[PDB]
Each structure stands twice: as structure tokens, then as C-alpha cells.
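Example record used in the benchmark description.
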Amino acid sequence: SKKSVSMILDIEGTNNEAMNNSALLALNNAQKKLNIDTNKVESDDSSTFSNSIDILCNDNYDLIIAVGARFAKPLEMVAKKYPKQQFAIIDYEYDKQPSNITSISYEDNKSGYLAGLIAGKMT
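Model output (C-alpha cells):
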């Protein structure tokens, strides 16, 4: 039975481009080892971030991955409303880590760790 992963990225400016590309490569690499569907959402408008994550929580994804520290607040808010939904955030660590949110460093994003994490979560 196929699993599905959605990735939401902050594309305002150019300062996130490298990290964004690494996140996308990691997802593509995971897909090659697993039986997974993928989807991506891109936005430069941080005001719509919480709405967009909420929509993904109603689209049957086994994992929702947010790329960038600008997702910190809207992701924490939405994750409270969907306790069984698994989420990941790249380049941010919460002081008090929510039980359904896994944090991944900028380093782990490009080391193969992210693809591995996705594989372990999907299996």
C-alpha cells in the first residue's frame, strides 16, 4: 500500500535556494528506494502558510515536510489540531518539541539523513 509525502517550501528571495534544492533531492532519493507518492507546495507569502499546512492535513499524507525556519510558528499551530499527523521541519528546533514534529538540521538535510528519516518513517 503506497504511502505519500508532501513538502512545503518557502521561496521568498534566494537565501533558501540551496537548502530547498537539497530538501527536494532528498525527497526524490527517498522515492527511489520506497513506494511513495510525492507532492510539493511552494509559497513566498508567509501569511498563507498555516492555511496551506491545514489543507495538507486533509489530503491524506503520511508525512508533511516544511522547509525553513519561517514555518516554525504556523506548523506548531496546525500540528496541535491534527495530533496523529506526522510532520518534519528542516532548519529549526523547538525549545519544547511537539510530539508529532521531527526537527532536521541544515546539515542532516543534505547528508542523506533526510532520505533515511523518510524511509524509516514510511516503514
